[PDB]
Design goal:
It catalyses: L-seryl-[protein] + ATP = O-phospho-L-seryl-[protein] + ADP + H(+); L-threonyl-[protein] + ATP = O-phospho-L-threonyl-[protein] + ADP + H(+). It holds the Pfam family Pkinase. The chain is α+β, with helices and mostly antiparallel strands. The protein has helices at about 50-65, 100-110, 115-130, 185-190, 200-215, 225-235, 240-245, 250-255, 265-270, 275-285, 295-300, 330-340; strands spanning about 15-25, 25-35, 40-45, 80, 90-95, 100, 135, 145, 155, 160-165. It folds into two domains: about 1-95 and about 330-345, Phosphorylase Kinase, domain 1 (2-Layer Sandwich), CATH 3.30.200; about 100-330, Transferase(Phosphotransferase) domain 1 (Transferase(Phosphotransferase), domain 1, Orthogonal Bundle), CATH 1.10.510. It is built from twelve helices and ten strands. A five-stranded antiparallel beta sheet has the order 1-2-3-5-4, with no helix packed on it. Strands 6-8-9 form a three-stranded antiparallel beta sheet. A two-stranded antiparallel sheet has the order 7-10. The chain is globular and about 65 Å long. The two termini are about 20 Å apart. The structure holds the ligand *CCS(=O)(=O)N1CCc2cnc(NC3CCOCC3)nc2C1.
Length: about 350
């Protein structure tokens, strides 16, 4: 077969010249030469079958990426697995190899206003397709945004994605654990389960702030510290925004806080394009109901050199409902993964 950094990687004969890229929990990524298409690809090895939650994420990611077809969304080129359910222990996902990710780029490179503009456009173009399919990404962050050598951007990792459910969004105070901390909308900590499109917009606003300065705008050190950073920049919510928060625990926590003034965007980002700061303000709006939508963000004057609604496609078939798999045993999830991957055999 093939071994990488003390681990089996049975992708051959089609894929050879294996080189380690990175690793996560139960997931390992390698680059490899595709002998059929004569190009280097990215191969992710997943072994989720012992954990029901890992099976959930694997199935969700596979189902979504197989249905989506968009230039700003990473596709699935091939899926490698054993010919039978009994012999299937690992799943290998073959995807286009990208040069870097926005996280790695932001750590060493200053972005020009043109780059920020092109990157934001592509993120919103991809996000318009995702929201049109009634899907929420729920984990938008720089490390989930891949880039090629020509700055073409692709959104990846749909493992935490859900079908939008605005009707069932309300919850209690300090309960929800949606997105990566620094990219978590303020409503997650107050009264939202993160079942509305507005949570993706907040994350995009955080990414834009990070492209402008090369630093996370709200670097909370822990879960409870996140709301302190957001309110430290945005200032105290208005009476109108507090009237939208009916949960007494969340409302009284906000009322207990001393008055804080809004730190102006121009003071935080003195080099930023004024139009980028106007758009940033609209994405990083405290009240989710007043927060700008993906289609409005695309039409903002900051993006006027790229804006073309006829070249910003929507999904052919939206997801009607979410799959009832939070209680499906790992064995039934294994069969579904097996069925979903059969087209690649
Ligand atoms: C969210 C993408 S991933 O982590 O599942 N994954 C699979 C797809 C892919 C494609 N290309 C690359 N390239 C690397 C090169 C080194 O810098 C980071 C990106 N990575 C991935 C990761």
């Amino acid at each position: 077969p093939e071994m990488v950094r003390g681990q089996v990687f049975d992708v051959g004969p089609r894929y050879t010249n294996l080189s380690y890229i990175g690793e996560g929990a139960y997931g390992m990524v390698c680059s490899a030469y595709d002998n059929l298409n004569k190009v280097r690809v990215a191969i992710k090895k997943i072994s989720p079958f012992e954990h029901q939650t890992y099976c959930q994420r694997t199935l969700r990611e596979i189902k979504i990426l197989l249905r989506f077809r968009h230039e700003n969304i990473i596709g699935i080129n091939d899926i490698i697995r054993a010919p039978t359910i009994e012999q299937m222990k690992d799943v290998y996902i073959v995807q286009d190899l990208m040069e870097t990710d926005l996280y790695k780029l932001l750590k060493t490179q200053h972005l020009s206003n043109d780059h920020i503009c092109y990157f934001l456009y592509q993120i919103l173009r991809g996000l318009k397709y995702i929201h049109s399919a009634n899907v929420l990404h729920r984990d938008l962050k720089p490390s989930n945004l891949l880039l090629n050598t020509t700055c073409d951007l692709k959104i990846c990792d749909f493992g935490l994605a859900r079908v939008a459910d605005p009707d069932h969004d309300h919850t209690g105070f300090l309960t929800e654990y949606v997105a990566t901390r620094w990219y978590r909308a303020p409503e997650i900590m107050l009264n939202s389960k993160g079942y509305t499109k507005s949570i993706d917009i907040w994350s995009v606003g955080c990414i834009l702030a990070e492209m402008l300065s090369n630093r996370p705008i709200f670097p909370g050190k822990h879960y409870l510290d996140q709301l302190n950073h957001i309110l430290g920049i945005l200032g105290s919510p208005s009476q109108e925004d507090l009237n939208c928060i009916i949960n007494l625990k969340a409302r009284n926590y906000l009322l207990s806080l001393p008055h804080k003034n809004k730190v102006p965007w121009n003071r935080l980002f003195p080099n930023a394009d004024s139009k980028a700061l106007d758009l940033l303000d609209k994405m990083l709006t405290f009240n989710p109901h007043k927060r700008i939508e993906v289609e409005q963000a695309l039409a903002h004057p900051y993006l006027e050199q790229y804006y073309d609604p006829s070249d910003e496609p929507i999904a052919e078939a939206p997801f009607k409902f979410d799959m009832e798999l939070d209680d499906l045993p790992k064995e039934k999830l294994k069969e579904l993964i097996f069925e979903e991957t059969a087209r690649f055999q």
